[PDB]
């Protein structure tokens, strides 16, 4: 009932992963933090007006 031994199963290509440049995550997060505080203050004035 198990996959049959020593045959070609699914591909070995699905193991592939896209590497991340190890600076994108941290600075992207900080950039969104600052842009978000700007946008929230902006909608604070939006509703206040």
């Amino acid at each position: 009932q198990e996959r049959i031994e020593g045959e070609y199963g699914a591909s070995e290509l699905a193991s592939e992963r896209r590497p991340h440049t190890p600076g994108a995550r941290t600075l992207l997060m900080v950039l969104l933090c600052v842009i978000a505080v700007v946008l929230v203050t902006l909608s604070y004035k939006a509703y206040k007006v």
Partner: protein, 753 residues
């Protein structure tokens, strides 16, 4: 679920644009785009001056610009591949078996890969009209390309029949493009698109590498792409991928483009830029000196595991960056690129970027290292495989060059490895060098020398009228010391020979001395008790063995005797050639051949013999001394496979005028070392400075670097009268069999060493 998943697939036929052969050289397409494939033996690039490759590109572009219709296209294809077709050869001689096992041991860790170039120039009643129009146009294109590739050794691929069925020659190549293997594609009763793929490909969702699931094993391929040129189109800048350690398939495309459209593209560049460079560019384009076209190059490396194919891809990227064409691996369009290799697929090309035509012919000058043909030869497999200084192995006649530089070593090596064909050999050598080898190959070697009885004589010859003609001719040629032979002399000799060779005289009694009883005074010297009585007046006078040898060393100083000795030996060997693989060889040819008699017989019987598997393997120590005479001229011009050797002294006149050797190649030959083993093979127009070498090396067996040396076979093959004069002693003491006395000969060698 099996059928449900089955029927819901996109077959590979959607991506393969081919159909019935319409002409024996031209393949149709569902869009009616007829094409032909051009197998090319790319001319050498290493052995040429830098300006001369420019000249080659000039000639090639000049021929192209005549026929480059706005409807054309080109797909070059340099499919680097490793050789699986080279069968191990059976053998009988122990010495040959040892030599071949050692030699094939010397190839552990060598690039055994051969380049294979290509080119595919692409192009109801009115459907038929379009049919003949396209066929005639493409057939003219094929004729023009054939006439333009005279020095490129091109061969148009066409249908060949095997076993009462049609097998396509191009379809095998295009299938190799699709499958990654070489599956012999027959001509069945469907569209080729239906049944031309026998390997289920698999492409990664996010990546550059794929995988071909075949019976014989998986092959993982990683494509690559060129996207950034530079301010240069230096000739053959993509040569670096010829020397690769990774088996791949390069690709190109040149969708030739209309002069108005090309002029508009160049006007666009001019406008964006806006001096003199584009002035001359546009002026040439109008004046018809190049034809722009849309181009794309996709190197695809083949490998066995995904890590290794990525490693090869990084290597290829480094190689391309070395020659200033910035490559970027194809990632999103891997499948589009892989379907963009099959000729007649423009809709699948990733990055078509217009370029000058000179430039395209500079991305594919059809350069190639000389490699030769492993299989398919008239005899079968290739005789030997030789190291090349370039690195790519050559899958191997007139040897010329000052001796002791391995000429006897080389000829012994070839004649020792050529026994996979079971060929007859007849070796006229000089200075007893080949005696040891010819004995080792288990054949008779006659060591002719002055003062000892000759051992063979025409006394017992067959009596047929043709043989009577020959023997009359011989005695008319033997007669020389006496003086001029008159008509009366001829009649006397004829009557005497006829009478002697009658049924009334016993064969055992027939000798030159007996002939005298039937010109007399002049023949006395050739009879017993005379100056030459030891040669042809023996009491008793060849089908036993295979590899014969005869020594004619003392005959270089003999004006008279060369004609009789060579006449008799050659006549005896003439009856041998009845279709069996026969290999005449020689040494310092001209002096044996410096005879007024048999130059005409040699040329005529040469044309005759060449039919039933005949070969002449000449040789020479002083090529200057040979080209002077008349006889050597026809033989220099009648040898296909030159093999030049080195010399501290060289002359321009002989090497260029006589031997059809170019100036760059001649300077290359001069540049060779004095005793460095390096010989320039020149089969045809192609050249390659190969070198068979017998140096120290290591063997990868059981993790043991078993030091293996070829000197135990060098002191056998190498010519040495000293070594031969003790080899003869040891054979005299024990002459049982070369398979038997070989260890004890090596023993006595170790005793003197």
């Amino acid at each position: 679920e099996s059928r449900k998943l089955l029927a819901s697939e996109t077959p590979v036929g959607q991506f393969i644009p081919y159909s019935h052969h319409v002409t024996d050289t031209i393949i149709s397409t569902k869009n009616a785009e007829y094409l032909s494939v051009w197998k090319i033996d790319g001319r050498s690039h290493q052995s040429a001056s830098e300006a001369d490759v420019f000249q080659w590109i000039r000639e090639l572009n000049n021929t192209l610009r005549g026929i480059s219709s706005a409807n054309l296209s080109l797909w070059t294809h340099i499919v680097r591949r490793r050789v699986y077709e080279y069968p191990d050869a059976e053998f009988d001689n122990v010495f040959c078996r040892q030599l071949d096992e050692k030699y094939r041991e010397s190839f552990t860790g060598y690039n055994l890969m051969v380049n294979d170039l290509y080119l595919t120039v692409v192009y109801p009643d009115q459907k038929k009209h379009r049919q003949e129009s396209c066929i005639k146009a493409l057939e003219d294109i094929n004729r023009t390309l054939g006439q333009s590739f005279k020095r490129y050794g091109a061969e148009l691929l066409s249908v060949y029949e095997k076993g009462g069925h049609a097998f396509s020659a191009p379809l095998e190549f295009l299938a190799r493009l699709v499958n990654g293997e070489h599956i012999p594609m027959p001509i069945c009763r469907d569209r080729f698109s239906d049944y031309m793929a026998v390997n289920r490909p698999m492409f990664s969702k996010w990546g550059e590498v794929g995988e071909l699931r075949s019976l014989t094993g998986l092959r993982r391929f990683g494509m690559l792409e060129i996207r950034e040129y530079d301010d240069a189109t230096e000739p053959g800048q993509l040569n670096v991928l010829l020397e690769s350690d990774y088996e791949f398939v390069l690709t190109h495309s040149f969708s030739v483009l209309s002069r108005p459209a090309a002029k508009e593209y160049l006007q666009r560049h001019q406008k964006n830029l806006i001096i003199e460079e584009i002035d001359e560019a546009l002026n040439q384009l109008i004046s018809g000196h190049f034809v722009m076209g849309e181009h794309h190059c996709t190197l695809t490396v083949y490998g066995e595991t995904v890590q290794q194919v990525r490693d090869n891809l990084a290597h290829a990227s480094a190689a391309m960056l070395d020659v200033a064409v910035l490559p970027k691996p194809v990632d999103l369009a891997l499948e589009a690129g892989y379907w963009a290799q099959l000729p007649a697929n423009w809709q699948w090309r990733p990055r078509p970027a217009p370029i000058t035509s000179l430039n395209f012919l500079s991305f594919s000058p059809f350069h190639n290292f000389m490699s030769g043909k492993p299989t398919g030869n008239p005899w079968g497999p290739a005789v030997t495989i030789l190291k090349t200084v370039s690195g790519t192995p050559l899958y191997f006649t007139m040897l010329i060059g000052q001796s002791s530089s391995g000429k006897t070593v080389l000829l012994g090596f070839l004649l020792a490895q050529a026994q996979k064909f079971k060929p007859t050999i007849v070796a006229f050598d000089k200075d007893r060098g080949m005696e040891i080898s010819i004995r080792a190959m288990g054949g008779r070697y006659l060591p002719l020398k002055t003062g000892e009885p000759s051992g063979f004589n025409p006394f017992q010859l067959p009596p047929t009228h043709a043989n009577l003609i020959f023997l009359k001719q011989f005695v008319k040629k033997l007669a020389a010391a006496g003086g001029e032979v008159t008509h009366r002399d001829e009649e006397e000799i004829d009557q005497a020979i006829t009478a002697m060779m009658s049924d009334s005289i016993d064969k055992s009694l027939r000798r030159l001395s007996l002939l005298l009883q039937f010109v007399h005074a002049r023949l006395v010297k050739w009879c017993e008790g005379g100056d030459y009585g030891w040669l042809f007046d023996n009491p008793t006078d060849l089908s036993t063995h295979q590899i014969y040898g005869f020594d004619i060393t003392e005959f270089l100083d003999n004006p008279e005797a060369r004609t009789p000795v060579m006449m008799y030996l050659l006549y005896r060997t003439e009856s041998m050639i009845d279709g069996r693989r026969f290999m005449y060889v020689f040494d310092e040819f001209w002096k044996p051949l410096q005879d007024e008699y048999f130059e005409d017989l040699a040329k005529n019987k040469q044309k005759t013999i060449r039919k039933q598997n005949g070969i002449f393997v000449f040789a020479t120590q002083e090529p200057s001394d040979a080209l002077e005479s008349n006889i050597a001229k026809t033989l220099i011009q009648q040898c296909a496979t030159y093999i030049f050797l080195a010399n501290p002294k060289a002359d321009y006149e002989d090497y260029t005028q006589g031997f059809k050797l170019t100036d760059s190649e001649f300077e290359l030959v001069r540049g060779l070392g004095e005793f460095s083993r390096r010989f320039l093979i020149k089969q045809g127009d192609q050249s390659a400075l190969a070198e068979m070498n017998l140096g120290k090396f290591r063997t990868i067996v059981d993790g043991e670097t078993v030091e293996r040396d070829f000197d135990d076979e060098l002191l056998v093959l190498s010519g040495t009268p000293d070594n031969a004069e003790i080899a003869e002693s040891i054979i005299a003491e024990v002459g049982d069999d070369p398979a038997v006395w070989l260890p004890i000969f090596l023993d006595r060698v170790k005793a003197e060493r």
